[PDB]
Amino acid sequence: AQTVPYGIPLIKADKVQAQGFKGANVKVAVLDTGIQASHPDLNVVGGASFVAGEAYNTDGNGHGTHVAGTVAALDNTTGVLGVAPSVSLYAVKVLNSSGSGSYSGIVSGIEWATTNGMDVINMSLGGASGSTAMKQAVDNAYARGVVVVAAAGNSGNSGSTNTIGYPAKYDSVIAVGAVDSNSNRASFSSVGAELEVMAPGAGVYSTYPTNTYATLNGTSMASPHVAGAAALILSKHPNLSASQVRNRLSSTATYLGSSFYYGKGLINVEAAAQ
Ligand SMILES: [Ca+2]
C-alpha cells in the first residue's frame, strides 16, 4: 500500500499531478547529507559528493533521504508519494553524517548544480552567518535560470528579531517557513522580513535510511515541498524563467497573516501552475 503524506494534498500537488504533470524531465538537486539511493521508493539519477570519505549515494544521517522523498518518492504501490515523483533526482552531498558541512563544500555543491544544468536546487540547511562566496554562487545559479529554495530556519520566534538564516536570507533564494496539517505556522519556523512562503514542515512522513519511512519536524521538510512545486510548475510551462516560476509561487499563495510570520502564505501549486 502507498501512503500519501498530508503535505501533498495540502499544497494541492495532487490536483496538478491528476492533470498529468509530475515534474518529468525536470532536474532537481538536493544539497544535503546524501541519499540512500538503494531505497525502493527513490530513483537517484546521479550526483556528487564534496564531503571527504563519503560517496554521494549513501546517507549516514537520514536527513537527505527524507528531504529527497518529499520531492520525488516514486508513485507506485508502496511507501509514500513525492510532490514531483517523475523528477530527475540528483544527490549532491554537502553535509557529513553529523549534518554539518563547510562553506566551501556547500559552495562547490551550488556550483556543481548550476554547471550541470540543474533546474531546481534544494537546500534544507542554514547557518547564522553568510559568506560572500556563497552569496555569489547563489546569485549566479538564480541568474543562470536555476530555482534556489532554502529552509528559512528553525530559530522560531524571539521577540521582534530576524531569525532567518543563510543562504535562505539571500535575495536569489526562496526562504521557506513551516506549518502543520492545520496550516498553522509551526512554533519553530523562523521569522523575519525575508520569509517568502510557507509549506508543510510539521510531522511530515517521508523516505528514511535503510528502506523505511519516518516522520520529522523542521523547515527542512518544508523546503522540499516548494522545490517539488517549482518542478511541477516547470513540467507544465517549460518556457518559464526561474523568476517567473518563483513569482507564481508567492503570487498565488494562500494568505495566512503578517508577512513577518508567514511571508506571502501557504503555497498552492494548482493555482501557481493553473
Ligand atoms: Ca511510493
Domain ranges of the chain: 1-274
Mode of pairing for the β-strands spanning 204-208 and 212-216:
antiparallel
**What separation in Å is there between the alpha carbon of 7 and the centre of ligand 1?**
14
* 241: amino acid identity, one letter: S
Q: How many Å apart are CA 88 and CA 117, to the nearest integer?
A: 11
How was this structure determined? It was done by X-ray
**What separation in Å is there between the alpha carbon of 256 and the centre of ligand 1?**
31
On whether the 1-274 domain is CATH 3.40.50.200, my answer is: yes
3-state SS assignment for residue 207: strand
Q: Is 62 left (phi over 0), alpha (psi -120 to 50) or beta?
A: left
Q: Is 41 labelled as part of a ligand binding site?
A: yes
Q: Is 80 labelled as part of a ligand binding site?
A: yes
Which residues neighbour 175 within 8 Å (Cβ) at sequence distance 6 or greater?
A: 150, 151, 152, 164, 168, 169, 190, 192, 194, 195, 196, 197, 263
**What separation in Å is there between the alpha carbon of 2 and the centre of ligand 1?**
6
Q: How many Å apart are CA 210 and CA 213, to the nearest integer?
A: 9
**What separation in Å is there between the alpha carbon of 52 and the centre of ligand 1?**
32
Resolution of the PDB structure in angstroms: 2.2
- Residue (of 161, 37, 26, 129) closest to 87 by Cα position: 26
Q: Is 95 labelled as part of a ligand binding site?
A: no
Map grid coordinates 540547511 to a residue.
125
**What separation in Å is there between the alpha carbon of 206 and the centre of ligand 1?**
10
Q: Is 56 labelled as part of a ligand binding site?
A: no
Which residues neighbour 136 within 8 Å (Cβ) at sequence distance 6 or greater?
A: none
Q: How many Å apart are CA 30 and CA 115, to the nearest integer?
A: 15
Q: Is 43 labelled as part of a ligand binding site?
A: no
User: Could you tell me the sign of the dihedral formed by the alpha carbons of 114, 118, 119, 123, in that order?
Assistant: negative
Q: How many Å apart are CA 69 and CA 86, to the nearest integer?
A: 12
**What separation in Å is there between the alpha carbon of 76 and the centre of ligand 1?**
5
* Cβ-based burial of 130 (10 A; exposed 0-12, middle 13-18, buried ≥19): middle
Positions annotated as catalytic residues are: 32, 63, 220
Beta-carbon count within 10 A of 45 CB: 12
Task: Name the helix (H) or strand (E) containing 198.
Answer: strand 195-200
Q: Are 150 and 58 in contact (CB under 8 A)?
A: no
**What separation in Å is there between the alpha carbon of 207 and the centre of ligand 1?**
9
* Cβ-based burial of 33 (10 A; exposed 0-12, middle 13-18, buried ≥19): buried
Q: Is 125 labelled as part of a ligand binding site?
A: no
Q: Is 2 labelled as part of a ligand binding site?
A: yes
